Amino acid sequence: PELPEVETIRRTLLPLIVGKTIEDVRIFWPNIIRHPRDSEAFAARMIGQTVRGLERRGKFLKFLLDRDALISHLRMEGRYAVASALEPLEPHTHVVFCFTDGSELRYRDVRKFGTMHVYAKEEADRRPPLAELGPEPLSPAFSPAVLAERAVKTKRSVKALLLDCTVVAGFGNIYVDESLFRAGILPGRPAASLSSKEIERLHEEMVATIGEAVMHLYVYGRQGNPCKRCGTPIEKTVVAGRGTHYCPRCQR
DNA sequence: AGGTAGATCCGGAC
DNA sequence: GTCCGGATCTACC
Ligand SMILES: [Zn+2]
Incomplete structure (x- = not known):
């Protein structure tokens, strides 16, 4: 998606996840995760944080949690959706954030080109991919x-x-x-x-x-x-x- | 010193 | 096979 679509995603996704707390993070294609380099540390640190906001810089979406920011780039075909943990997963779902309310934020990308970086909030703007x-x-x-x-x-x-x-x-x-x-x-x-x-x-x-x-x-x-x-x-x-x-x- | 080109990822399309 | 792409990251001056 291009900047306009990302701004639409930011506006429409926020209400569907604001206030939910992460109970689990499942990764089916580790390479999407760029920081921390270890996808298990990425998953572990997110557990227990509540989503507080969602901003956009360029084509990057910045999810604001309690202590961390998750910076995401969908590249050409990435897409996010919110649905029930009881339903079968759509094809090409590579990262799923499971909330305590039984809903999930799902990341899908046929091309697998998107990226995710997680940093303490006060640091995200000074590190990649947002730094320059x-x-x-x-x-x-x-x-x-x-x-x-x-x-x-x-x-x-x-x-x-x-x-x-x-x-x-x-x-x-x-x-x-x-x-x-x-x-x-x-x-x-x-x-x-x-x-x-x-x-x-x-x-x-x-x-x-x-x-x-x-x-x-x-x-x-x-x-x-x-x-x-x-x-x-x-x-x-x-x-x-x-x-x-x-x-x-x-x-x- | 640091611009800037080349390499890179990934899997549909043609 | 080949082409194509955002934003790195690496390497050539
Ligand atoms: Zn004309």
């Missing part, structure tokens, strides 16, 4: 100025810059391509080649694009179809190592 996370795209801390500073100092493409989690938090591939199209900027453009007028326009389109979503598509996945604004066929290439879509006529 950049500003939320919809916050005043993400400004044209901040984008300009980062763009000027690198030799990488504008796309590579926007995908960098230390530049802006959790702005995905789809939003990068749609934002560049709305701003009229080619994805393969060196970040340092953007003018301040372009940087400002890029910043505004990033905010409206992700803002509209959190609250169809022009180019993402529309390879070979006509551009919705000019009819020119949308092209797809590899930029910054990822599938990249753009209109050759409208983006410069």
Whole structure:
């Protein structure tokens, strides 16, 4: 899921688990657990804590418990659900948190790409995976100025810059391509080649694009179809190592 | 010193 | 087999 969906999960999941106390933690794919490295220590420390809140930073969900924070990333296909311990488990369930009330928070992920880190709360923001996370795209801390500073100092493409989690938090591939199209900027453009007028326009389109979503598509996945604004066929290439879509006529 | 590219994980799809 | 992907983490200057 992308940032908008993660924000929806955060909002909808909180009420389904707030106030429940963990009685057991079962792990069926140890590799999801990144800290503590030992999945048995991860399970043991969570036992007995009550869920007090659920926040989001970028695409990471931060579960707040009594003493610890559990930081989770669903990557492309992870998903959470709350259900009864009496019912059979859905396929690909790799981590289950069993609550004292007989309900469970289940983590499912066909690809097994997601990650979980648990740290004492006061420490989570200073450790991986949250440590060097950049500003939320919809916050005043993400400004044209901040984008300009980062763009000027690198030799990488504008796309590579926007995908960098230390530049802006959790702005995905789809939003990068749609934002560049709305701003009229080619994805393969060196970040340092953007003018301040372009940087400002890029910043505004990033905010409206992700803002509209959190609250169809022009180019993402529309390879070979006509551009919705000019009819020119949308092209797809590899930029910054990822599938990249753009209109050759409208983006410069 | 520290940017930055390359490697990495995993299992559907084509 | 091959491709693909977020955010590390490793290694090359
Ligand atoms: Zn166009």
